[PDB]
# Entry
Amino acid sequence: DIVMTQSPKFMSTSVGDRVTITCKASQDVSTAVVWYQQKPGQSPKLLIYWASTRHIGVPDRFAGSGSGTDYTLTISSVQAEDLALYYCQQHYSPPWTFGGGTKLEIKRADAAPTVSIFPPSSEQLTSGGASVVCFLNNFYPKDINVKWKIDGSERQNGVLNSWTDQDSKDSTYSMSSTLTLTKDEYERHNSYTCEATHKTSTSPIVKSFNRNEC
Amino acid sequence: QIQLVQSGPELKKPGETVKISCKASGYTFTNYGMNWVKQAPGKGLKWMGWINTNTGEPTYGEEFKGRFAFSLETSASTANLQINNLKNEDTATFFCARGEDNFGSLSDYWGQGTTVTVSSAKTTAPSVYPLAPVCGDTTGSSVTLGCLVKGYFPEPVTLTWNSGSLSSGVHTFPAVLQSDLYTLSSSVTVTSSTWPSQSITCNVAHPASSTKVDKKIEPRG
# Structure
């Protein structure tokens, strides 16, 4: 079986640049390399076959190149909509073996996280459960660090982080950190602090609470 | 152009068998054979084999021989995958692509997928909660509201802020599995002028167990 090898596994450039992505294989596959692009939550699509023939409707800006074992998709004018995984695939002999994909992140400019802490809903409080949600929203780069400190103490169990993938439109990232508890756990404490370590500052972003009217 | 649609995403517990369909719009079924690709959240894309939509000749990639069966309902221009004696290892999303050529070296056009979840878990409909703020300067001239969807199985879950019409500002997060069920969040930052002036709402359809909530985010502030 032929073995399509890809490395790197993540790649990034800014808007308007060029990027190049390496696909190689076991033996000489005689230019018969296909390129797909699969954008997050979408079918793959055919970019390119015979390492250079653009498929109907893929723009001039995606160029095919290669020979022997060695192939490279080059994108130019990296648009915001080009973050996706790129996949190569042999089509010289069965079975058609695919590379393992490569993520294209678009390197953006820095952006500080917009953070928001949230109280347990009286509705879930009648259920006997308490979750304090914090959103850390629209940051750049992908590197956030999110601790909770219930009553000044690093609570490091009960939390679940979820992350958005890179935005198509503005190239940021967002994240959610829900920290569940039980009612008599919640009701025994009173400061609740979500903290955030991120490159766009030194002084840790902090969203902290307890109830009162507004 | 060619418009292949695939069946909805099933939950079948170990041992069972699932029918997965591809229905061919666009081309003349018979002169272009169906390709089936598996995508685990792992490797990436895997070819399972082709089906000669003319004679019905099937070809299977080694890892696929025997528990899998490509078939067609010709008439309907439909192609079907069948996984029998289902393993939790088969937990993944499958595709029918259309083979450009004889055997399906290139795959011009892919259906939207069908996600199978092999699992013993119970379908537990969600509890939807409106996450609204205690107070504070949320960045500037803006207020975020939120919504948590804890308790459902299996994914999907369709969330919509005010009937779809509220779009700009949403960040719906991925679901995450804590042991037996999923938990979800979505945020929507509105302008200070829009709330509690206008009526923001967390509309939730859990297709899987007929649940559909619309919690309102009452001011509670």
Residues 1-120 of chain B form a domain with the Immunoglobulin-like fold (CATH 2.60.40.10). Chain B touches chain A through 49 residues (CB under 8 Å).
